[PDB]
Amino acid sequence: MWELTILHTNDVHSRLEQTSEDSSKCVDASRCMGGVARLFTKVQQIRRAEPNVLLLDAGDQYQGTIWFTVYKGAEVAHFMNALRYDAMALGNHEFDNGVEGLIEPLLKEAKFPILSANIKAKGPLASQISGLYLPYKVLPVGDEVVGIVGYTSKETPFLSNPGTNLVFEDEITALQPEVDKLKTLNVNKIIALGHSGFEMDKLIAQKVRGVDVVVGGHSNTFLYTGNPPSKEVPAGKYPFIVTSDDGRKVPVVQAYAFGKYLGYLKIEFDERGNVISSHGNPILLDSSIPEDPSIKADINKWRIKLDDYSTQELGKTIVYLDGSSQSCRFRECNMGNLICDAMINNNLRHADHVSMCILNGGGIRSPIDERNDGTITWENLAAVLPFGGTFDLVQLKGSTLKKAFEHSVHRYGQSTGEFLQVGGIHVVYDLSRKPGDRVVKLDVLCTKCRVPSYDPLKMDEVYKVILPNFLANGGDGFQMIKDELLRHDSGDQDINVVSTYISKMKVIYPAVEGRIKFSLE
Amino acid sequence: MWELTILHTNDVHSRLEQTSEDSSKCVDASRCMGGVARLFTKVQQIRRAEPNVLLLDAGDQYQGTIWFTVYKGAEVAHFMNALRYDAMALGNHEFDNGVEGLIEPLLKEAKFPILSANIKAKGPLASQISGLYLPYKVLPVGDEVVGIVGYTSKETPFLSNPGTNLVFEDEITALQPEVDKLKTLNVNKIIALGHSGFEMDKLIAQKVRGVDVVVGGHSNTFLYTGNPPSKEVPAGKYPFIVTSDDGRKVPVVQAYAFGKYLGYLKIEFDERGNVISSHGNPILLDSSIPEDPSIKADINKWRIKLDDYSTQELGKTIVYLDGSSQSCRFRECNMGNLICDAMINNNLRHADHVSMCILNGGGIRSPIDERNDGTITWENLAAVLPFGGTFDLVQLKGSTLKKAFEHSVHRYGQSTGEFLQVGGIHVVYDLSRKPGDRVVKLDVLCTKCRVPSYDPLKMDEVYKVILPNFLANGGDGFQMIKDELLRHDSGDQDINVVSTYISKMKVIYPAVEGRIKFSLE
């Protein structure tokens, strides 16, 4: 028997410092979690105890906090190198600052292999990018070798900015030839490490002959065996067992997001590289684990440049600003209401008027806590709106807007980002009904009236809606908006609109007030 | 036969200049109405045609616009003298600036008798006020004499500030001896002119032996025979006929409010002063009647001092601000929502927190139009909030608040001012139910929660509510607030709170959004 311990992270999203339990800014240090200093301590503790260890990342280190807005990936390469990661797979967010934003900060400075078997470069780019990322790496682990094959969401061209030179292939189609090449080289222990979501990860495990383990990301999937340690509810056991088509039991793992947990899987292999068994669980990186002093002092050094975004108080909140995924992708969330109210307010002070707002819940990427004397800084807002998008004005038919709201709940319950937050709209859904027929009530704030009031949406009428450019361009499957819109005007930067509105209000208290409801029946 | 024409006004409330159809500021002069210059033209036209004319006012000339805030009744005495009123009865609003605010500006400068038979002065005041107002006046009208007996709401001590020296008697009890004294003096034509509301006016007509006609006010009652000329819906025919207990047909008249109409009643008397018949209708003072040039030039002279309140733009509205009685005393009105939002905002920027607001609809005393490039001035706000009240903080039990909301609709449909406008509250009424059991749903914005949301009000819990001092002191029959409150802190001046909030928002667009609803059942 040969035992291997796989340590893994995914969707860290620039949470370099320890955070609050909700992954927003750490205020009460005594109860904070995650961060790279705490992760280091745990990884070192495991490396001391276990002789065969691999520390892996399944992508999306890029984007999420002022660390990335300022260091643009230099903090990733630096701290991933300090933690001595063995390999990383490319995620969609590694392409947000173009291919240039991946090459210079990360690929040239990473001391570990960076992987993706389904990204093929064509034309001019092919020449420069060659060899800076690999389809796989064969890693010596003691007296054995372990092959790692990478993969990246085939949806990255739509989700990010990888450019016209990179081609994204079907993951299973691209992986099988690389795994087969590893098998011809007598590499009998193979890990598929990649960034496509738990559903694709299970398909890779079922279909790619020769894969012993799948380590994934993108879906922020929390898996656990037994009673869980924090607020995340498990989507399945850890590991999740897939029975492959050729009859093998394949463990599939993921470790939520934000560096809150360290994924930990122990695999028992035979002499031919068959998985005899495996077990483990994600480790909660809570205050019980001390932050490594050396890494923490280095974090404090890099933190000095960021304190310019933490000094200006933009305003104050006397309520918890719920920007959590568990709220904003499932029901009315007060952060969504705040952002839509700021969106509506911004245009109603612009010239040449609109009362309605729609906002993809997945575009709200962090809550803000009210306990730090309720202070709101640019840094706090940077984590809520980290993408540098704009809030555009569009003219839509009622029919188009009804289709959008049907799309908002067409596959409800999967923590997908299309669920819409709103302003100037009162929507009622009946989830007992079939996809495409779940909107039971859709009232909107009249525009062609002297006193605004809510009246049923009319399919043949035309409404002006303020929304993110992501939705106006057909993102999150809102193809009907892009295809059926009658007008599209570019708007102001998302973060600046909310920042301006908070400074104007000074004290904010957004509530959940019935803009989105769910019927009984 | 001896014919008398009674011309009458009531509840003019400082609308010296012509106004918009809703009695707010005149912007589109071509379609404006009322004002003392237009009234003059009509009165003069009638005086030229009819030999026996009496022009009467049934009180409440005081309070309503920047004219009264600045001239404090000097404009009333001046312009009522210019129009040559024959008599006036004291209304409750004539006592808002104390007895001193009635004596000096009006009683000493009025060239016509000022009447009230049920106000008896006691102690020191008795001596000075003696003879400046009278219980009645016997007026020569051609070769005949007409007796006018005055009366004032017995509720004036609670509604206004008449002081501890004036006693207000039951109107019927005080009137009969004065009418009997007029009858002993062979005065066979008697008009009761007063300010107590249409219901008391009908009782006076039924019960006071010897009264031939009743000319009233206070209830802003619109009466009409036939198809009406504007938006006011008649509460009955003009005149309203009461059959007295001694079997006489007694006409009862009123002429809405704000100088929009001139009441016009022609009475045919026999030689013994019996009413043979009567007929007429309120005359709509619309653009068809020219404004007298002389009075208009004198109005323009007095207007120069007021233009300091019309120059500063506090902000802009892109919606009609519905502060009409027909909306705010009957259902959710967007002016009410604006004021409650300003009330909540003001305390949430004060120190040492509250999410709920209640506002008596009768305290909103004018709308604001959005068509003048949407501009909002101090003058526009002065007509909405003309009383100089404050928005106080109170701590109430849920039981107390439930009783208040029951009181809000206990006598619904009478255009009474107790109907509550709200903030941070969602109330549902069922008017099919009995008084005291009409609140079917009362949800409130939680305070003891990190994310505010609406939850059912709990009878044994305690809530912090911002409301006018008028309600905290038990006004509008809200005795339960004054008696059952747990804490009462004095607040900022009503107009300044709304003014500050509009300047902060710059562009406002308050909607009717479902804070108050009425069920089917």
Ligand SMILES: Nc1nc(N2CC[NH2+]CC2)nc2c1ncn2[C@@H]1O[C@H](COP(=O)(O)CP(=O)(O)O)[C@@H](O)[C@H]1O
């Ligand atoms: N307001 C937005 N702007 C942008 N834009 C692109 C950049 N330039 C500005 C416009 N992208 C957005 C917005 N809201 C959502 N998305 C995208 O939708 C996805 C959210 O799903 P997820 O969290 O499940 C997948 P992940 O993050 O784990 O890979 C991400 O790809 C995110 O980028």
Ligand SMILES: Nc1nc(N2CC[NH2+]CC2)nc2c1ncn2[C@@H]1O[C@H](COP(=O)(O)CP(=O)(O)O)[C@@H](O)[C@H]1O
């Ligand atoms: N916010 C308020 N403040 C005050 N205060 C008193 C003065 N000092 C500040 C506090 N009074 C108020 C408020 N709201 C309502 N009222 C009173 O309620 C009545 C409204 O009913 P109505 O229009 O049918 C009777 P009217 O006007 O024809 O005689 C009036 O008497 C009015 O004064």
Ligand SMILES: [Ca+2]
């Ligand atoms: Ca194998």
Ligand SMILES: [Ca+2]
């Ligand atoms: Ca008589």
Ligand SMILES: [Zn+2]
């Ligand atoms: Zn991610």
Ligand SMILES: [Zn+2]
């Ligand atoms: Zn991703």
Ligand SMILES: [Zn+2]
């Ligand atoms: Zn009045």
Ligand SMILES: [Zn+2]
């Ligand atoms: Zn009155």
